[PDB]
Ligand binder design. Structure first.
Ligand SMILES: *[C@@H](CS(C)(=O)=O)[C@H](CCC(N)=O)NC(=O)[C@H](CC(C)C)NC(=O)[C@@H](NC(=O)[C@H](CC)NC(=O)CCOCCOCCOCCOCCNC(=O)CCCC[C@H]1[SH]=C[C@@H]2NC(=O)N[C@@H]21)C(C)(C)C
Ligand SMILES: *[C@@H](CS(C)(=O)=O)[C@H](CCC(N)=O)NC(=O)[C@H](CC(C)C)NC(=O)[C@@H](NC(=O)[C@H](CC)NC(=O)CCOCCOCCOCCOCCNC(=O)CCCC[C@H]1[SH]=C[C@@H]2NC(=O)N[C@@H]21)C(C)(C)C
Ligand SMILES: [Cl-]
Ligand SMILES: [Cl-]
Ligand SMILES: [Cl-]
Ligand code: NA
Ligand code: NA
Lengths: 306, 306
């Protein structure tokens, strides 16, 4: 038993991380097969990141204007193209450690592991969620771009995020592995703001089910609620409205625990209105929203089948 | 910027994980060089884990009573010995992926990454701390024994924990890699209890420095305190007494931020007496104690030198 912010094992992604340098710009690349993927802003100088012309910048470059190092061993670039906001660099050697993989574009509320990298080298792993405003609450410094987010399913790595920038609020923005931004953001040093964020209601409910699985039951009450009366309360506390589809995906946890989804909604309603009274739930004084229903089943049972 | 519960990249440890089976007991082993390390209770049957005689159980076994699988490929055992609560299994093949490593025994308050494993296969990574009562607040199920805790320094893996059991309070106990229990625990299914736990004061202070580094400053006040007047308050809230040695190891964060350690103690005193008033610090309503001073410097700067 126990319930932690759990990330996927990072080794399969570590074997893909390389360094990419173009001019006075160095960052991280993802080496899969004979392609290295990386943020297109590697082709900028610092003096030219406010409103760059990537199209011009790219034609002006040749394959020898890209040092790719896999640790110590240079990889010769033999081709270069841009898709949306990523650079694809064709190299002369397929990565022997390329895992089984997919490029996926995730939905807001979905979680993933981030391998934070510097100088093409893995530094740390943590878990986070695509926020409803298409930002992530990451931990990233200068040099971290090209770090990726991923889920693992079987021996299959689903890459979902590549890091590009920090907004002034201290939150992070990036792309899918086809180079398409999550949210209404562009890769330039302009005054962009995220939407006001919201609490991921279905994840809060999933995490109250994890608390019950782990013997933490004090907040369960004898009441029920309708979906609309729940949303009337929840939206007052800046929770996303709960949808029938979200009730549906909670069904397996409801069946496992014997607590009806709208009964768990009743418990959450009372927690929002009354607060916790100095109590905690799985060691938290806040209601956590960065575990999906799948995350709860994986950590509480699925891992034993690894 | 940003501050997450960050684990070390797990790939170097993933390359060491194998499965060990002896009879009706399967768990995880750590394969370094030509030795596999694992909990000695692999030599029990379930019916015989209440008060086993490991000495007897061990002599009754031969090298062919141990199936070691590195994924699909069996490793022939050519010798077997017991040190404290670990089994060492000599095999005929040194692990080609053995990292540079040390066995270290950590202190209470120190943090480490856990690679949780089932069937000799990596399932998840999370960060935790050796609690003052020599337990850890883990996430472990049936099949997880032999999962390890570690820190990485350079390319060097310091192994500090091997998982053996869960106490009735839902917390975890285990050994160093020489098989010595952290705390007053034994590897048998008897009614053992941990000491009442305490809050790791120096880690709370480290995490208030991380909050200041990351622009979260609301809780800083104009006051100072003496060490004894601080401990008078802190011990009332179940905090470990702050020692001069703990003040000393906060010095680098004090110099970086320009906030004197005893001024930060004054801010923590006011937080303990008044509470947060619905405010949060780095997204928490509780004062977090599972980041060391080193953890804060690593995540806020050190990683850029990876
Ligand atoms: C990874 C990179 S690496 C290489 O280090 O590995 C890092 C990861 C960072 C992290 N901590 O997570 N990423 C980066 O460093 C980013 C790279 C960028 C290429 C995306 N950068 C950042 O993350 C930086 N973040 C930002 O800069 C953010 C969001 C991008 N923004 C801000 O912080 C707020 C800044 O606002 C300042 C105001 O900016 C301008 C306002 O925008 C509107 C104007 O836009 C149109 C521009 N117009 C022109 O240029 C016209 C020119 C010609 C006509 C002119 S000339 C005379 C006329 N008069 C006029 O008025 N106009 C006419 C960072 C580093 C975190 C801060
Ligand atoms: C990893 C293993 S694996 C194989 O699955 O990979 C797992 C990880 C578990 C996890 N979730 O983290 N680990 C385990 O399964 C552990 C393996 C063990 C070998 C350590 N087990 C556990 O973690 C279990 N945990 C526990 O069992 C814990 C702590 C060990 N304890 C409890 O939960 C509380 C249980 O208390 C029950 C009472 O027990 C007995 C009281 O103890 C005092 C007595 O001790 C002396 C015994 N005396 C004798 O035997 C005397 C016999 C002869 C004389 C007798 S006969 C007639 C006379 N009359 C008398 O009165 N006496 C005389 C677990 C699985 C989590 C619950
Ligand atoms: Cl939701
Ligand atoms: Cl302390
Ligand atoms: Cl909290
Ligand atoms: Na919803
Ligand atoms: Na102390």
């Amino acid at each position: 038993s126990g319930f932690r912010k759990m990330a996927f094992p990072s080794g399969k992604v570590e074997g893909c991380m390389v360094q990419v340098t173009c001019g006075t710009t160095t960052l991280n690349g993802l080496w899969l097969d004979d392609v290295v993927y990386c943020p297109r802003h590697v082709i900028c100088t610092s003096e030219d990141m406010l409103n760059p012309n990537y199209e011009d910048l790219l034609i002006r470059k040749s394959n020898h204007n890209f040092l790719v190092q896999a640790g110590n061993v240079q990889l010769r670039v033999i081709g270069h193209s841009m898709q949306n906001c990523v650079l694809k660099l064709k190299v002369d050697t397929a990565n022997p450690k390329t895992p089984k993989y997919k490029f996926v574009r995730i939905q807001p509320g979905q979680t993933f592991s981030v391998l934070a990298c510097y100088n093409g080298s893995p530094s740390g792993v943590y878990q986070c969620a695509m926020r409803p405003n298409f930002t992530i609450k990451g931990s990233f410094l200068n040099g971290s771009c090209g770090s990726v987010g991923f889920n693992i399913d079987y021996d299959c790595v689903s890459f979902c995020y590549m890091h590009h920038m920090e907004l002034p609020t201290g939150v992070h923005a990036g792309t899918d592995l086809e180079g398409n931004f999550y949210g209404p953001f562009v890769d330039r040093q302009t005054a962009q703001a995220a939407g006001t964020d919201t609490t991921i209601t279905v994840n809060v409910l999933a995490w109250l089910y994890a608390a019950v699985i782990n013997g933490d039951r004090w907040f369960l009450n004898r009441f029920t609620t309708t979906l609309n009366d729940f949303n009337l309360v929840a939206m007052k506390y800046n929770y996303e409205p709960l949808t029938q589809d979200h009730v549906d995906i909670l069904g397996p946890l409801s069946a496992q625990t014997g607590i009806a989804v709208l009964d768990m909604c009743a418990s959450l309603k009372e927690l929002l209105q009354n607060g916790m009274n100095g109590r905690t739930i799985l060691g938290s004084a806040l209601l956590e929203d960065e575990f999906t229903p799948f995350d709860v089943v994986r950590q509480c049972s699925g891992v034993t089948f690894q």
